[PDB]
Amino acid sequence: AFGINYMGRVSTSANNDTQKVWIYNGTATGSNETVATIAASGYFNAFMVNVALGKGPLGVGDLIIINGNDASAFYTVQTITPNVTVSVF
């Protein structure tokens, strides 16, 4: 499942009028799950504070660098409520 210790910020800017970039560690040293498993719908629900209302660190349009145990790809947040769903970038 999602582990907060494997999620980290990439974008240094604190400007809240632009999107943020994240990185996730699902490799052997991290969550040890495939890219498809991490990119599944609702996987990042535990990261949000209240996913039912779309309240959390992730915003719509944020770019996530997902490193699975088999490959790595760029993904973009499409929705934050009622589930956090991503699609390739």
Next chain:
Amino acid sequence: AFGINYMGRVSTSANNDTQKVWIYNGTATGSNETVATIAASGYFNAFMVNVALGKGPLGVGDLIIINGNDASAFYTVQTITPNVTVSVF
């Protein structure tokens, strides 16, 4: 050869349980070498402290943005010992 002055860090997070993002300036204003030369095996050995024991700032799964003098490409670190090898992202 590898030049540390042309190596920078993109990811702002200091969390060591996730991965890091680097950017390398191999263009005419940097090392002035092709992407193939930079992506060759053992090119980033000088960046590590003890590459024989896999001790250094680079970690497995780290994303490197290589800006060669002819093109640019995203790469990912696979091994840090006994050599530093990257592959196409």
Next chain:
Amino acid sequence: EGMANQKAPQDDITPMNVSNRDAEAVIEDWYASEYADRSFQNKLAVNA
């Protein structure tokens, strides 16, 4: 153990990670006891 690395000027610092672990000692209780009947106070040349 820590480790020292190099970096470009004005680049962000990248620490070499230090590991941690723990060691656990289990506490046990032991007793050494004896009795000395008062009827032996006057019958012994030693202090029991």
Next chain:
Amino acid sequence: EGMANQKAPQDDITPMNVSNRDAEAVIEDWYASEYADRSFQNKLAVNA
């Protein structure tokens, strides 16, 4: 190192050339660093 040689009388002196070289020590910078998150302050008995 120098060296002594021989010459014919009244001939011009021919020095045995003494080589020179410069040993250059290149200065490098090394950093040893670590982080101590505040969330571990109350969760640790040690001073990290």
